[PDB]
Structures are given as structure tokens and as C-alpha cells.
Amino acid sequence: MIMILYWSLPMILFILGLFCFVSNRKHLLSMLLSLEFIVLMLFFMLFIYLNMLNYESYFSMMFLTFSVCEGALGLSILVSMIRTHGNDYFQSFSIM
Amino acid sequence: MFYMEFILSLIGSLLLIICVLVSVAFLTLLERKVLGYIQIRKGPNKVGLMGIPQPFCDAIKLFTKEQTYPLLSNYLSYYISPIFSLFLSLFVWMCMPFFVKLYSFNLGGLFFLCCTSLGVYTVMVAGWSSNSNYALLGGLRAVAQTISYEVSLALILLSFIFLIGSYNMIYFFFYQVYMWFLIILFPMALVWVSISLAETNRTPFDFAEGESELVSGFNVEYSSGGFALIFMAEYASILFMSMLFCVIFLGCDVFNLLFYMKLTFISFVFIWVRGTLPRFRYDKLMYLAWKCFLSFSLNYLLFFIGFKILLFSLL
Amino acid sequence: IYYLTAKKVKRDEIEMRSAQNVIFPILVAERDREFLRQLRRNRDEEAELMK
Amino acid sequence: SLLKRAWNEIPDIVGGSALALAGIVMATIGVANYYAKDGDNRRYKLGYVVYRHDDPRALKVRNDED
Amino acid sequence: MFSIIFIALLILLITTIVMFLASILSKKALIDREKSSPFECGFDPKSSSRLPFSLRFFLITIIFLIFDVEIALILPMIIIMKYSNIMIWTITSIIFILILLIGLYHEWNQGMLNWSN
Amino acid sequence: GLEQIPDE
Amino acid sequence: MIQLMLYSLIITTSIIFLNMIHPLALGLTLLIQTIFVCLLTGLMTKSFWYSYILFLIFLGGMLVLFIYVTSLASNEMFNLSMKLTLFSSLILIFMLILSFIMDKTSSSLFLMNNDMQSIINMNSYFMENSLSLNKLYNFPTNFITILLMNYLLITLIVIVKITKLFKGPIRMMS
Amino acid sequence: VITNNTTLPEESELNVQELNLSSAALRAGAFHLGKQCEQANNEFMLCRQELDDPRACLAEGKAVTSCALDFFRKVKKTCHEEFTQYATCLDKSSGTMAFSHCRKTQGVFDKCIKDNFDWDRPSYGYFSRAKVIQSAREAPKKEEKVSYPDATPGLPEDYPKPPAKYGSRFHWLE
Amino acid sequence: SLTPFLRLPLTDLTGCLINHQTYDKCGKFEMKMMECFEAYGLERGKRECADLISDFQECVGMQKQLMRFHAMRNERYKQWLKGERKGQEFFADPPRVDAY
Amino acid sequence: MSLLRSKYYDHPDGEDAFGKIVATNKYAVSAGVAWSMFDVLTLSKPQGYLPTLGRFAYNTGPLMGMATAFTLTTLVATNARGKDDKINYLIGGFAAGGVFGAWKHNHVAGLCAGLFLGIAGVIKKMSIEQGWEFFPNTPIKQYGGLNIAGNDWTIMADPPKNWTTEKP
Ligand SMILES: COC1=C(OC)C(=O)C(C/C=C(\C)CC/C=C(\C)CC/C=C(\C)CC/C=C(\C)CC/C=C(/C)CC/C=C(\C)CC/C=C(\C)CC/C=C(\C)CC/C=C(\C)CCC=C(C)C)=C(C)C1=O
Ligand SMILES: CCCCCCCCCC(=O)OC[C@H](COP(=O)(O)OCCC(C)C)OC(=O)CCCCCCC
Ligand SMILES: CCCCCCCCCCCC
């Protein structure tokens, strides 16, 4: 009940973001946007944890930095697709 | 919280919105008069008494001309973007340092950066949704412009904040009781004037709405109200960064009429740069705000870090 | 001139903090007396409600 | 040799490097001046602090003039 | 912040009423076939603007994103100077700005701040 | 003001 | 009341975000999602700093992602559906009714605000973002900040290595 | 939480007269108040720090409120109108009631205080320093180190280490 | 807390990341739990520190306090639905805002 | 707290029926749902709402037939003769193999699967009567080698501790 009344919601939204990340979409940039959404909901849950504690919210910027560098890695992978393919279709990539 | 507050905050915010809108109209009149007087010619003189109701002529016509229903556009996204542009350009004005408690913005610099980033979001949404090649080129030029000036605008703000020690702009008033900050920050008086013209999409950085490189920029498919709200959003941004030049570099007092005389003078400076300098290329803008402005901002941030440690030991 | 201005602003801030430090003990005394009264009221009301 | 090329082509970088070196020198001077005296034991203290007479922090309390 | 929400909703409401008043009082003429067409400087377009656009500043955009999250770690230390060890604060601050200067000047040396072309 | 304070 | 309204708006925008094929629909949906998430995060902390920081982060990120929208999948069809509009409207009105008939003391967050802290807390009387952000620049965890500076420099080196600028611009069918 | 085993002071103890002055009336004459109530405030805040229990130092809170009430009676008997003018100037002169906005009425009030009770105004940073006092109550004992007679023990360094019998004793090796 | 596997100088920065020692009401309780986590160990501390673990857990997680509060709130609404509690006297007297 | 929350060996064998059916069909449900969840997405995708449930039933229901036939055959063989032993589990495994042969329309699979499940049944019966456990809790769990206290390599200095081994 206590786990249901508090912080049960961002688990559901993180599950919805995970299902948006793995859904059959035509482009990689939709998966990058779903990554940005699960960064947002991980920020929500980490922010709930760091705000039960009083003065430990300084960590909430470090998670932002590692997540932005994840997004920059994904954006540079999206650039490196154009170096080899002409497209970002997930059907166009090799299945093996 | 006392009930009367909410009422007086609502009244003061609405009065501020109305006065900023009529000052946008008279700012168009001021630009059309002194910008003529930048050259040899005169401003608007015939209509009305001495050209004073000329923005009323410009506002009656644009609120009655036929609304464009473009063919290849996404109209449901094309109709909404100038509304949000005017909404953020008037929503940024709640950050104004009042000596009465209008709003207790402890984080006014972050609020200014958020609305600054959101106004160019409305510009680049309006550029894409028109479905024109010149509109998309103006939108992508606006995105390249904000990617050029955003981190430079932030670090330069931090250097001013260091001289304050807090993010509340009313604390600019206590640190300027003996002199203005134009004495210390003259190289960033030039640099913040350069950034503030890139913020408001004004000459020499006018790539989002180009009249010679492109055809009206991203405003090519906007007419009769969409163009009106886009134009008031741009000029309210001009008024806001003129106000922020008066807050940081000049006296932050608001109970003197000399502050509003200075704000009219900085708006005249904003017109004055447009009437003198030619436009850049946004290649040279990106090579300027990344290799000169950012490096100077980091270096003089180091200078202010060392000066604030030197000052803190003496106190 | 900014160093002199920072001296003046620091003097005003120290005066305001001294006013806060001299006002606070009366406020926290009133806080603890009302806190103990409300704790007694809450303990009586919980005993009344959960009978 | 390379200073004249940098002062001809990128003079704002040279001026910023001079300003940053001056800032590093002033930071060193400020840190040395802060730690030369008892800078950790500041004269005015945030909050309401009371020390007993037998406390070891009691004799470190300054008695300067405002 | 609850008052900022209400006044933001009021500004959005006022701007929608202003745009709807501009639409209502506008002149209502019949829509021509070639009036609605995209402008394209008076001629036929040959291509939609949904055609893919070439990006020559991709590295500058990702460096902008990296530098912006670097901005997100500078903004605390205005407040932290009065409440921390001065030695540790100076080591962190001068080392932060010098590492940013090494990175920016190194990519200036490589020429990666120039547009691809 | 001080008119709130009772006389004693 | 505002917190439950933000709950309902976040739920409705998450249903909208799970159902949008087009990248710009995802971008606008995550715009309003990060607006609502920024306001909700603010409610939990004594100060409003990290909401502002997260808004600068998530407006610096999708500014780049629109350029990749216009460079890759610029031409893709929007498909409005009446079922999604009816579902979102019915769920939104149902959760506003359910939030109106709910006790808001039980549904409020237990995380302490700046005024929920007691008067005796002398650390609450300081400047509002001082003690929260202090440990970034203090002695035990300055080395993590050092690691983050070096990590961002290594990130930039990785981005320069795997986005070769001399191979040319990027587009569809390059 | 509060249970039936924990004692609480009765309602008859907490029903004493309290200071009901406003913020501008407390800020006016705030520097002259602490020169008369230095002993009660320091004792009450010192025993509030270490004891950390609202049931303790209740009589110290009574002494603090009695000293503040006695000072306000002494202000009220002699030149009440000057204090009224100073409190009105401090209320109406600025949003944050700063003493620097009007100093003429502050000078008149300090002149009346010096003419009546021969009290001088302290400096601007008299109450913001560390204050050392001698307290009548004894200090609370420092906690003893926790004892663990059955801990997790290791091999001590002075333990003798003879060579192993039959070597490794693991698969024919010795 | 956890343990460092194959511990190096690189764990000295990581070890002080998130803890309750920085100006928190719970941290002393946490410190006491860490005391037996230094004495008994991580594995004997799961069995011989059941009292010190639970005090820290319902001190910072506030599980039992919030279950108590939600039982106090649900019983009042249950009495209102059953008709024992009148709608005019549904809520008790409010505390002063200067309290707590 | 229901009849679904029951085990196979909560009662002696032959005493209870419905709890054994529910337990063995519960393991059949878990195995069939897991295999069909890694089946219908990965190989031979049905591309429909109804053939997905058809493949779920195809991978689930014969395992229910296996479980029910083995448990009923073991129950009948336990209730027939007085002694409980291994060849009751052997003929239950042969009944489950016959269910496999009825599934796949191949008698040879039905026999070979009957022999394999009978060997599994007699080994499980040896486990339950001899007392040894297939997957026991691990008695010896090395969290390291020798000197796990002595290889603390940290550069920061330890502050003095708040605990002593000395009695007060
Ligand atoms: C050699 O070869 C060539 C040729 O061959 C020979 C050619 O032929 C040509 C072609 C050239 C030509 C044909 C002619 C040459 C062209 C030029 C000379 C053009 C260059 C000149 C200019 C661009 C003009 C100088 C620029 C100026 C003056 C800047 C300002 C210009 C404007 C248009 C701004 C005016 C717009 C306005 C004011 C918008 C209106 C909106 C408002 C008024 C809104 C404000 C609202 C309010 C004030 C009130 C609202 C209040 C509200 C809503 C709330 C109130 C509520 C209450 C309750 C009170 C070329 C180039 C060539 O090379
Ligand atoms: C339609 C919304 C457009 C986007 C607005 C973005 C605002 C800045 C981001 C943010 O989170 O700011 C935190 C700030 C926090 O407030 P501040 O810390 O600025 O001020 C304290 C507040 C009465 C003391 C000054 O909140 C807002 O700006 C309110 C946004 C209202 C949005 C209404 C619609 C949902
Ligand atoms: C580049 C480093 C700048 C800061 C140096 C701080 C230490 C200065 C010397 C202190 C001696 C006690």
C-alpha cells in the first residue's frame, strides 16, 4: 500500500518508456527519444530517493551528465550509421 | 498566504503585460522613426498627428487582412506556434526586478535561460510547419544561431553572478549603489550586446528572418496575425534584453525615471546597431561564439574566480 | 570601488543576520510550547478516535 | 615567434590568457592570505552558536572590533 | 510556483484570445487554388521541404550538448564559495576551467570547430 | 504595536 | 490539488508518448512531459534548482534532435486517430474527477519542502541551495567531480573520433 | 511518534503569556533587546542544541519570554511614540525590513533609549559572533564507545606461525 | 552497505557518495548500524543487528510512521462512510502554523 | 492463502489428489508460458491476436496433459498397492510419454519420452525417499580467499572507530 501510494507511478511510466524503447519503430531516433523519456523517469525516481535524504541531491546532476553522454553516444552512433549506410532504418541494418 | 497578495500579483502582472505590449508598439514606432533618422530621411509623420498613431495603423491592418491557409503546411502546428512565441516573450517579463514583491524569483537567471531557450523553440517550430524551403532554412539558421550563442550566454551570465554572489537580480541593486557595472564589464558590455542581438535575432545576426539571403526567413508563410504575434514576440524580446542591459551594466533601481530613460536609450542602441553594421554569415557567427566569445568568457571567469577569492580573504 | 561596495553590502547582511539571531530564540520558544501543546492534543485525539 | 603570430591573428585569446594568468595569481594570493590568518575561524558565524567555557572551541573565538 | 503556473495559463489564454480575435476580424475571402501554395519565390517548388537536409555542423551540435551539461556543473559554485573549504573550491574551479580550455583549444587545434565541407 | 501588550 | 493534476497530465502524456510513431510527436510529447516532470520534481525539494537544471539539460538535448529529425526522417506522415483522443480525454476527465474526490493529505508526497521543515532546523535558515550543492565541491567528493571533468573530456574525444568531420555532411542516402 | 509511555507537560504549564508582537515591532529595538536578554537566550539555545528535546528547557523558554516581555514593558513606559515611529518606518520603508533604508528615526529612538536608560546600541555584528557563557546546569556526558565483546576476530600478528603439517595436504602435493 | 570487491584506491572517491552523515536526522542511527557493520561484518550484521537495521529503516524510510498515518486517515473516512462520524465534526481542530 | 498455493509434497503421496494436480499443473503452466513467451515472438511469429493464443494453448495444454496424466497415474499406482516405490513413478513417466506421443502423433517419441520421464521419476523418488536435495542451499560460501581483511588497499586514512572489543 505504501509502495502503491508513493512512487508506484514512475515504475509504471518507466515500464511504458521501456516498452516504447523496444517497440517496432521504423527509425533509431524514436528509440533515442524513448531513451530521453526513460532518463526523465529515472530522474524522477532518483529524485524521490535523493529527496528522502536531506542534503544528498548533489548526485542528481551526475546522473544528468552520464545520461547526456549516453545521448551523445547515441547521436554519434546515429552519425556513424550514415558513414556506412544511407539511412537509419532498423530493417536496413544486418540482423546477423 | 494573504488573499490580497494574489490579487495584486495578478493585477501587477496584467498591467505589466499590457504596458509591455503598448511599449512594443511604440518601440516599432521608435525604430521606424530613429532608423529613418539614422539615414537622412524622416520617420512616419503624416498619419495621425505627428506619426504617433502609426502603430495603430499597423495593428488595425494586420488584424483585418486575410489569414493564410497554406496548402502543404501542417496547419494545426502552424496556427499554434506564434501564440506560444508571444506567450514566452511575455512570460519572460515576470522575471523583472520589482522593488515591491511582484514575484520572488530567487533563480531569475535560470528562468531567463529557460525562456530564452523556449523562444527559439517557438521560432524553429514555426519555421518547420510552414512547409516552405525558405522557412525551413530560416528555422535551421535559428537553431544554428541558438546552438552558437547558448553556452556563451550562460557562462557570461555566471561571471556577472559571481560579482553578486546570488541568483536574485534585486541583489544587483545593492552591489551597484556606488557605481554602475559598465566600468568593470565593458568588454562584456560589448560581448553581451553581441549576444543580446543574437538572442533577439537582430542585425548583425538576422539569419532567422533574412530579407536578402532568404525571403523574410521563417516568416515567409505567416500573414495577418501570425506575423503580428511573431513580430511582437521579437520586439518584446528586444525590450527584455534592453532591460537586462540596464539591470546588469547600469543601475538596477526602478523608482527612478532615469532607469526607463536608460532603457529607452538601450533600445535606441538596439535600433542603432541595426542601422550601422552589415549582417554576418552564420558560419562566421558559429566561428565567433565558439572560438572567441566562449574562450573570453572562460578566461574572464577565471579572472573573476581569482578576484572573488582575493576579495573574500580581505573581508 | 566594487571592493568598497562589497564591504557595505557585507555590513548590511551582517546587521540583518544579527537581527535574525537576536529575534530567533523567542520564536523557537513559542514554537516548542505550541509543539508540546499540539502533541498533547494529537495524543488525546488519537486515543479518542482509535477506541 | 609564436607569441607574435598569436597576438596578430587571435589577440582576444592572448588578452584572455593574460586575464586568466592574473586571475590564477590573484587566486594564489587570496588563498595564501586566507590561510595566513585564521580564515577557517570566521568572525561572524551563521546560525546561533553557543559554546560552554570548558569547550575547546571557546578559546578560539575572536574578539575583534567591527 | 503555483502563482507562476496560473499566470502562465493566463498569458496562454490571453494570447489564444488575441489570435482568435485576429482570426475572427480577418477578411474572409474565398480560397484560391494557387493562393495556398508554398511561395518558393514565385515559381513551382520541384521539391518539398520535407526532403532531407544536409548537416554540416553535427560535431558542433554534439560538442554544444556536451558543453551545455558542462554548464550545468558550473552554476552551483556561486553559492558554494562562502560555505566550503577555500583550497578545495579553488582546486576544483581552476581545474574545471583549465580542463575546458584544454578541450576547446585542442579541438580548435584539430579544426573540429570548423563546419564539415 | 505596544498597545497589544497588557499593563502589569 | 496541483500535484494530482500533474500526476494526471503525466499519465495522459505517457499514454500519448507510448502511441506516437512520428518523431516530432514524440518530441512535443516529451516537451510537455519534461515541463510537467520539472514542476513535479520542484514540489519535492526545498529549493527549485534541479528543475531548472533539468530543463536546461532537456532543452539543450532535443535542440540537436530536431536537426537530426530534419536530416533523417524529415518526410513521414502524421496520422491522427479518434480512438487515442477519446481515450486520453476520458482518462483525463476521469482522473481529474478522481483527484477532486480524493483526500489530498493522503495523496501528498512525504518528502519535506522548505516550509515542511521545522523551525528548530538551523540549516533550513541558510541560503536555499547552499548545503544541497555543497558536496560537489567539498573534500570527500571533489574527486568524483574531477572524474566527471575527465569523463566529459573523454566523451568529447570519443565524439570527435566516431563522427569524422572530414568524411562530409550527413543526410539520407549520403 | 508519541505514545502513552512518553511524558508530556500539562496544559496548565504551557498557558503562560507569550510575546504577540509583529515582525516590524520585533525588528525595531532588536539590538537593544539582546543586550538585556543575553543570559536567557544563550542558556536556552545552548541547552536546546545539546539536549535536543522540547520538554527540556521549558523554564528557559519561560525566562526568554519573561525577559522579552520585561524589555517591552520598559520600552512601553518611556517614549512609546518613538518606538511606534521607528516600527512604522521599518514596516513601511522596504519589503525586507532593512535598517539602512531609514536611519533618522533609528537615531531618534536610540537617543531616547540613551536619555532614558543610558543604554547604547551595539554594533552591527554583535549577535552574529560565537557567544561563550558559563552555564548553571551541568553538561550532558559524552556517549561511551559501543562495546562488542563477541566481535568478528582475526588472526593476530603476534600469533605463532609454524610451518604447515604435511604441506598443502591437497592432492598429493606434499 | 555493500562491500568493495578487489578494493583499490579508486573506491576512496566512490565510498563517500551517498550517506546520511551530512546534516541528517537519521545518520547517527545509520552510524550505529555501520558500527556493527564494522564489528560483526556484512554477513553477521544481517542477523545480529536486526534492531539497529530496523530503527534506521523506519527512521529514513518512514514505513511504520506512514502506515500509522494512513491507518489514522482511513479509519476517519471509514467512520464517515459508516455514519458514526458527523460531516460537520469530520475533521478535528487544526494546529497553529507556528507549531512544528 | 488458497488451494493454488500448494506444493506436491505437502502431504504423503497418495493421500491428497487435488493439491498435487494444482501443483504439478502449476509447474506445467510456468514451463509452458515461459517457452511460449520465448516462442511466439522469436521463431514462427503468428502475426495475429488469435493465432498467438493458439500457439500459447499449443505450448501449454499438452504440458497440462503431461502433468495431469503423470499425477493421476502415480495416484492410481499408489492407491492400488500398499507399498510406495519407484516403478509407480516409472509408469507415470510412461503415461506422460504416451501423452507426448498423442501430442506429436509419433509412438517412438511416446516410448522414448516415457523411458526418459520414467528415469526422471525414479531419480526424483530416490531423492524424496533418500533425503538428498537436488538444489540445496549452499553450506560453504567463500566470499574470498585468505587475508580478505589484510588486503585493504586504500589511500585515505581511517578515522578512529566508535566501537571497542573491550568489556565495560
Ligand atoms: C540593382 O538590381 C536590383 C533591382 O533592379 C533594378 C530591383 O528592382 C530591386 C528591388 C528593390 C525595390 C523594388 C525597392 C528597394 C527596396 C527597399 C529600399 C527596401 C529597404 C527598406 C526597408 C527594409 C525599410 C527600413 C526598415 C525599417 C524602417 C524597419 C521597420 C520595418 C517594418 C516593416 C516594421 C513595421 C511592422 C510593424 C509595425 C508590424 C505591426 C504590428 C504591430 C503594430 C503590433 C503592435 C501592437 C500594439 C502596439 C498594440 C497591441 C496591444 C494589445 C494587443 C493589448 C492592449 C490591451 C488593452 C486593454 C489596451 C533590388 C533589391 C536590386 O538589387
Ligand atoms: C507552457 C509552459 C512553458 C514552459 C515553462 C517553463 C518554465 C521554466 C521551467 C521550470 O520548471 O521552472 C520552474 C519554476 C520554479 O519557480 P521559480 O523558482 O522560478 O520561482 C519561485 C516562484 C512565485 C516565488 C516566484 O516554475 C515555473 O517557471 C513555472 C512554470 C509554469 C508552467 C505552466 C504550464 C504547465
Ligand atoms: C593552479 C592552482 C591555483 C590555486 C592554488 C592554491 C594554493 C596556493 C598556495 C597555497 C600555499 C599554502
Write the DSSP string, H68-79. HHHHHHHHHHS-
* Main-chain dihedrals φ then ψ at residue E49, nearest 5 degrees: -80, -5
Distance, in Å, from the CA atom of H59 to the CA atom of H9, rounded to the nearest integer, reads: 12
HSE on the CB side for G43, CA within 13 Å? Answer: 18
Cell of D55: 569547550
Residue showing cell 498467438 = J52
For residue G65, what is the nearest residue in chain B, using CA coordinates? B143
For residue D45, what is the nearest residue in chain G, using CA coordinates? G126
Give me the helices (H) in chain I, please.
11-14, 27-39, 45-48, 50-60, 63-82
J95 near J70, Cβ under 8 Å?
yes
Q: Are strands D50-52 and H131-133 parallel, antiparallel or unpaired?
A: parallel
Resolution in Å, one decimal place: 3.4
- Solved how? cryo-EM
For residue A94, give the 3-state DSSP assignment. Answer: coil
User: Is G26–A27 a contact, with Cβ atoms under 8 angstroms apart?
Assistant: no
In the chain, the amino acid numbered H87 is: A
Distance, in Å, from the CA atom of B193 to the CA atom of B152, rounded to the nearest integer, reads: 12
Q: Which ligand number lies closest to the CA of residue B32?
A: 1
B263 near B96, Cβ under 8 Å?
no
CB of E19 within 6 A of ligand 3: the answer is no
Distance, in Å, from the CA atom of D20 to the CA atom of B304, rounded to the nearest integer, reads: 9
Q: Return the bridge partners of H131, or none.
A: D50
Q: At what angle do helices E86-110 and G142-162 cross, to 10 degrees?
A: 10
Distance, in Å, from the CA atom of B130 to the CA atom of B79, rounded to the nearest integer, reads: 10
Mutate to test the interface with D, among B296, B303, B308 (most CBs of D within 10 A): B303
Element containing residue H146 per DSSP (H, E): strand H146-147
- Residues contacting residue B84 through CB under 8 Å, at least 6 positions apart: B122, B125, E12, E15
CB contacts under 8 A, G 20-59 vs E, are 39, 42, 48, 53, 56-57
Burial of D1 (0-12, 13-18, 19+ CB in 10 A): exposed
Segment J125-131 long-range contacts (CB within 8 Å, at least 24 positions apart):
J125/J85, J125/J86, J125/J88, J125/J89, J126/J86, J128/J9
D39 near B313, Cβ under 8 Å?
yes
Rg (CA), chain G: 22
In the chain, the amino acid numbered J53 is: L
G131 near A53, Cβ under 8 Å?
no
Cα of B72 vs its chain's centroid, Å = 32
CB of B55 within 6 A of ligand 1: the answer is yes
User: Is B315–C8 a contact, with Cβ atoms under 8 angstroms apart?
Assistant: no
Mutate to test the interface with D, among B299, B307, B315 (most CBs of D within 10 A): B299
Q: Please state the length of chain B.
A: 315
The CA-atom distances, in angstroms, between A32 and each of A24, A27, A88, B117, G73 are 13, 9, 12, 21, 13
Angle, alpha carbons B58-B59-B61 (nearest 5°): 70
Distance, in Å, from the CA atom of I47 to the CA atom of C23, rounded to the nearest integer, reads: 50
* Main-chain dihedrals φ then ψ at residue G173, nearest 5 degrees: 55, 55
HSE on the CB side for J90, CA within 13 Å? Answer: 8
Please state whether H61 falls in left (phi above 0), alpha (psi between -120 and 50) or beta.
alpha
In the chain, the amino acid numbered E86 is: I
Distance, in Å, from the CA atom of J12 to the CA atom of J20, rounded to the nearest integer, reads: 10
Nearest to E114 by CA among A15, G160, G25, B185: G160
Distance, in Å, from the CA atom of E117 to the CA atom of B287, rounded to the nearest integer, reads: 14
If you ran DSSP here, which 8-state letter would residue B167 be given?
Answer: S
Q: Which atom of ligand 1 approaches the CA of B228 most closely?
A: 41
For chains H and J, CB pairs below 8 A equal: 22
List the subunits that have 3+ CB pairs under 8 angstroms with E: A, B, D, G
Going from the Cα of G39 to the center of ligand 2, the distance in angstroms, rounded, reads 7
User: Is E64–G64 a contact, with Cβ atoms under 8 angstroms apart?
Assistant: yes
B6 near B102, Cβ under 8 Å?
no
If you ran DSSP here, which 8-state letter would residue A89 be given?
Answer: B
Q: At what angle do helices A28-52 and A60-84 cross, to 10 degrees?
A: 170
A80 near G159, Cβ under 8 Å?
no
Q: Are strands H131-133 and H146-147 parallel, antiparallel or unpaired?
A: unpaired
Q: Return the bridge partners of G170, or none.
A: E55
Distance, in Å, from the CA atom of B226 to the CA atom of E23, rounded to the nearest integer, reads: 10
Distance, in Å, from the CA atom of B211 to the CA atom of B165, rounded to the nearest integer, reads: 43
User: Is F2–H72 a contact, with Cβ atoms under 8 angstroms apart?
Assistant: yes
The yes or no reply on domain A2-92 and CATH 1.10.287.3510 is yes
Going from the Cα of B58 to the center of ligand 1, the distance in angstroms, rounded, reads 10
The answer to whether G139 faces chain D, any CB pair under 8 Å, is no
Distance, in Å, from the CA atom of H19 to the CA atom of E11, rounded to the nearest integer, reads: 44
Q: For ligand 3, atom 5, which residue shows the shortest CA distance?
A: D28
Is chain E touching chain C, with at least 3 CB–CB pairs below 8 Å? Answer: no
For residue D34, give the nearest of B300, B303, B313 by CB distance: B313
In the chain, the amino acid numbered G103 is: D
- Domain ranges in chain A are 2-92
CB of B31 within 6 A of ligand 1: the answer is yes
Going from the Cα of D5 to the center of ligand 3, the distance in angstroms, rounded, reads 31
Burial of E39 (0-12, 13-18, 19+ CB in 10 A): middle
Give me the helices (H) in J45-146, please.
49-80, 87-104, 107-130
Distance, in Å, from the CA atom of H100 to the CA atom of H93, rounded to the nearest integer, reads: 10
Burial of D4 (0-12, 13-18, 19+ CB in 10 A): exposed
What domains are defined for chain E?
1-110 (1.20.58.1610)
CB contacts under 8 A, G 77-106 vs E, are none
Give just the sign of the alpha carbon dihedral J71, J72, J73, J78: positive
J14 near J78, Cβ under 8 Å?
yes
Cell of I62: 518512514
